[model samples]
Target: GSHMVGQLSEGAIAAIMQKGDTNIKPILQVINIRPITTGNSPPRYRLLMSDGLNTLSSFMLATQLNPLVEEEQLSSNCVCQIHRFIVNTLKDGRRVVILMELRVLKSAEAVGVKIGNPVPYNE
Candidate 1:
């Protein structure tokens, strides 16, 4: 167990970034999850999700996923599999993945650390 990093599965955000596919549903760990309330906007979650290759820091999770987020189930490094998603272009000209359906695979307690080399998406 010295400097030998076992391979991790690629995340969803990375699939969209690298492969440039709209229909790519990525199963990744929630590297960072933040609760953001932007002036009158319903409570939402800001996710720093990773594809085990790269991290997408500009992603937003719908309020529907709030229960899980609030339940502390989506802690740092919690593995989640996105069931259905849609790639939408925001009015600000930013494209993001809209999580439609999700399934929790493992909690942060089980997988306490993040996997892969994740970098913020600058482009």
Candidate 2:
């Protein structure tokens, strides 16, 4: 049951980013993730994910969700189920997905490598 590569939600990134869709709760793979520190405030996590169609790098972890990363459960190549998320717009017309609740389905060590041949999804 830990196999994760072919179970991703196809076109979820475009649906969320382009059409403003929500509640899809797409399953995706974490291509990479890292914490972005800004001054003295808490560090926020940025993630790149793939839906088999393309890779999206416009994800941010909500402060409450940081512990998953802090505990090293969320990592590169891990497959995740995005249980809840919110799409926010910046003042500059850019968009970002704030991951609210998620769970890792497969670890990077299990999944082995990046899934399919996907290109970066540019906004």
Candidate 3:
């Protein structure tokens, strides 16, 4: 009877970001995608996601999730749930939200629609 935490809104996730101390995981929709370069071991990516209310895409998209992209499940309008994430403060004063333990809940084709009016993530 688990797996029913339900989905959260972008506004709610944004709030969590502001506080930066909580255990609430969120499911988000892919709205935009991009890449960044770094000398770190392995590799990572950056992407923008929406919660059907607002949007957030300020830092690297996190690396482990690249598999989600290679699998072709990460694309515009795709829905995914993240239970674990890493929030770190860059020397440039940016908080990077890296998605971890992520799983696709719905494909863009399956979703085939967008919800709520979204704006660029401001944080």
For residues 7-105, what per-residue lDDT tens digits would candidate 1 score against the true structure? 335554656755657554456778887777678877878788877767877677877777888888878988877777767666985667766688888
Query: Which pairs of residues have clashing backbones in candidate 3?
Result: 45-61, 46-61
Q: Model 2: clashing residue pairs?
A: none
Off by over 4 Å in 2: 1-4
Q: Once superposed on the true structure, which residue ranges of model 3 sit more than 4 Å away at CA? A: 1-8, 38-43
Q: Which rank order by TM-score, best down to worst?
A: 2, 1, 3
Better of 1 and 2 by lDDT: 2
Best by the lDDT measure: 2
TM-score, cand. 1 vs. native: 0.79
Task: Locate the minimum summed-lDDT window of 10 residues in model 2.
Answer: 1-10
Assess each prediction's global lDDT (C-alpha) against the native: 0.71, 0.86, 0.69
Candidate 3 — worst ten consecutive residues by lDDT sum?
Answer: 1-10
Q: Model 2 scores what on Cα lDDT?
A: 0.86
**lDDT of each residue in 31-120, candidate 3, tens digit only:** 777766667665566777777667777535566667777777788777887777778867986677777777788888977766557776
Ranking by lDDT: 2, 1, 3
Q: What overall lDDT, based on C-alpha atoms, would model 3 receive against the true structure? A: 0.69
Error of 1 at 63 (Å): 1.2
